[PDB]
Design a protein around this ligand. Structure first.
Ligand SMILES: N[C@@H](CCS)C(=O)O
Ligand SMILES: N[C@@H](CCS)C(=O)O
Lengths: 392, 396
């Protein structure tokens, strides 16, 4: 069993099989041909485990899937046009009218919109529960419960979930547990190893690393991934990942270990710094001693990650002033790029709302979120420091 | 004077782009970027509130895609466009946005297989009622409308029989009962047929086929009113499918569109010469091509398509086994699903797509044991003729 860096570079590919090419060639093709109608016939039931149309089985995409499956330690992988691609295809195939999905207390905005305004409107029952509270979770189960879905750590406050805890509970009811592992990557956390059934990824973020691609991943067990490929992707979503973008995702995956180390090192520093700031009410970073779920965090993540959330003392106004003053962080939604990013939802995403609605969603008035990039930590410090000056 | 619409080719190469707004770049740069940033936190406050113009995240809107979208809209004759990861991405994003439990969809009698799967085993398992109807029969369609009918959805010409519908007839009926008409316009492209100009509310495309023209990308387009395209963009795509089109692929789609009028003229000139030849060969029992008077809906084709297309279907004498022997003798056509490539493609559903079924359930689906489908490409006609004639001789 080769190491993670090795596998992330080499897994699933032998140059000697493809003309000696160091880097595998990109199958930017829509369709595939057949030597005979017989060899055609085989590929519409599926006996010679291989290549089928490119909206089902392109080699380039297969290489990506196998590598990601290796990295998350799962049976099988599926690549998709976007992270929503991955989550919609999974849920559309796993759920039907009357089934229930249990959801983590908070969710990526578009996931929430999919659940409450998408499948939810098609007769699927939604319940939100705190997924670190195993008793609340147990009590929430009903015969109807078929899926339990959550992120860990979860936007907005890095609130973790006890993956193995929930998974014990799901076994008692044959429920499928699905974990959005976008924030951690298989490099920092492997939820399948902790007993989840499927993981989903917005590969758009850390896995790509360079913010030039939109892509999605699903990893899990061959049977589940099979159904999602042939039902979710093929029939319900059509979220097909382009071969060019697959290749670039692979190119990005080759540095995962190296980039995530830096992202973390950079975040650790920025966070001990913020933790001492008198403009700072409160801070959420898994790697501080003050992080309420510190122990659970260290149990599931091998490093505390590249994301920080803090609340500024002066609410919306401070938030605004802080955001405007940054010259190195860019005001943008998104995360996991080489570039450092910030957002202040109160005055950005959730601006149109009001204080009382933002409290409902746990979006504090002065809540800012940092995606710490790979720039030099002294440059990142100077920027955060001056931006704090302006926030007075 | 200057209130005249530019020609189709002109709009295909230029619409929506002036080099002078991107520093003289003759070809638009490609926005291969996932995210966009904001100068002020206020500037971006408005981009989540309808006040200002710009882009937030390439899953919702992007300048490479926007141009592609605007060009397609101009070609189709519609208000707005939307570009997605595939034909199915376009179709599913649209129906997921437009339908809810208790709504009914009227469907054409036959469809593309994944569209059929999506409908029967996907959206239909979610509380949406389905009914099929001969769209060529306006009397039957009128009869089928009920106050639950929300959409009428069909392809014209349809897979795989090229059955056609009267678009303007359907729209007329739909305007009377109040349903949204969506037409899958893949086979024609906007160069041969414009359903929106005929009264349809939305067209969808597998741009993967003719629009791309070069079989290297998978991509979907939807075109219609600003108010429905936005709904679809903001609900279907953003929330329910995530069928995001890659800007690299959209740049290639745009590159392919630049020669559409030329590719199409040649697909059609080729198929016409092929069809006429096939109609006259001993091994050919039957032939379906819209440019032939023997085509059952000859009159609707002439009326609705400016040209008869690159698809031919034809039945062989000798039974499945002639088919096999034909398909396998081919040296220039390739054995393959798909259409609208530069390369000529053939398929023999009997010994291929529908090969697991026994000779019974194939005759049950209108599908002969001698049926073969041709997507005629852009090769030299004699070469194509020569290959097919050598191949008929083999299936003797
Ligand atoms: N995940 C980021 C951006 C994706 S659109 C966010 O939370 O806004
Ligand atoms: N539309 C073509 C190819 C897509 S798989 C077909 O009818 O099979």
């Amino acid at each position: 069993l080769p190491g993670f860096a090795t596998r992330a570079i080499h897994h699933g590919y032998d140059p000697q099989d493809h003309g000696g090419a160091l880097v595998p060639p990109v199958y930017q093709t829509a369709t595939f041909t057949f030597p005979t109608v017989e060899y055609g016939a085989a590929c519409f039931a599926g006996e010679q485990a291989g290549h089928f149309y490119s909206r089902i089985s392109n080699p380039t995409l297969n290489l990506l899937e196998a590598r990601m499956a290796s990295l998350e330690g799962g049976e099988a992988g599926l690549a998709l046009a976007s992270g929503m691609g991955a989550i919609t295809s999974t849920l559309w195939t796993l759920l039907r009218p009357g089934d229930e999905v249990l959801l983590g207390n908070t969710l990526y905005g578009h996931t929430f919109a999919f659940l409450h305004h998408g499948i939810g409107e098609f007769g699927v029952k939604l319940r939100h529960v705190d997924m670190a509270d195993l008793q609340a979770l147990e009590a929430a189960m009903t015969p109807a419960t078929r899926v339990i879905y959550f992120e860990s750590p979860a936007n907005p406050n890095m609130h973790m979930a006890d993956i193995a805890g929930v998974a014990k509970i799901a076994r008692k009811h044959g429920a499928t547990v699905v974990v959005d592992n976008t924030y951690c990557t298989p490099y920092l956390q492997r939820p399948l190893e902790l007993g989840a059934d499927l993981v989903v990824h917005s590969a758009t973020k850390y896995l790509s690393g360079h913010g030039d691609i939109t892509a999605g991943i699903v990893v899990g067990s061959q049977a589940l991934v099979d159904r999602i490929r042939l039902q979710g992707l093929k029939d319900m979503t059509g979220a097909v990942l382009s071969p060019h973008d697959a290749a670039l995702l692979m190119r990005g995956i080759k540095t995962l270990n190296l980039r995530m180390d830096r992202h973390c090192a950079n975040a650790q520093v920025l966070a001990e710094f913020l933790a001492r700031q008198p403009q700072v009410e409160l801070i959420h970073y898994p790697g501080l001693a003050s992080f309420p779920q510190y122990t659970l965090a260290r149990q599931q993540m091998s490093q505390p990650g590249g994301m920080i959330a803090f609340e500024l003392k002066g609410g919306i106004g401070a938030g605004r002033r802080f955001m405007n003053a940054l010259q190195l962080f860019s005001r943008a939604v998104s995360l996991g790029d080489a570039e450092s990013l910030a957002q202040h939802p109160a005055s950005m995403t959730h601006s149109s709302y009001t204080p009382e609605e933002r409290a409902h969603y746990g979006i504090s008035e002065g809540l800012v979120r940092l995606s710490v990039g790979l720039e030099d930590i002294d440059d990142l410090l100077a920027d955060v420091q001056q931006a704090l000056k302006a926030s007075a």
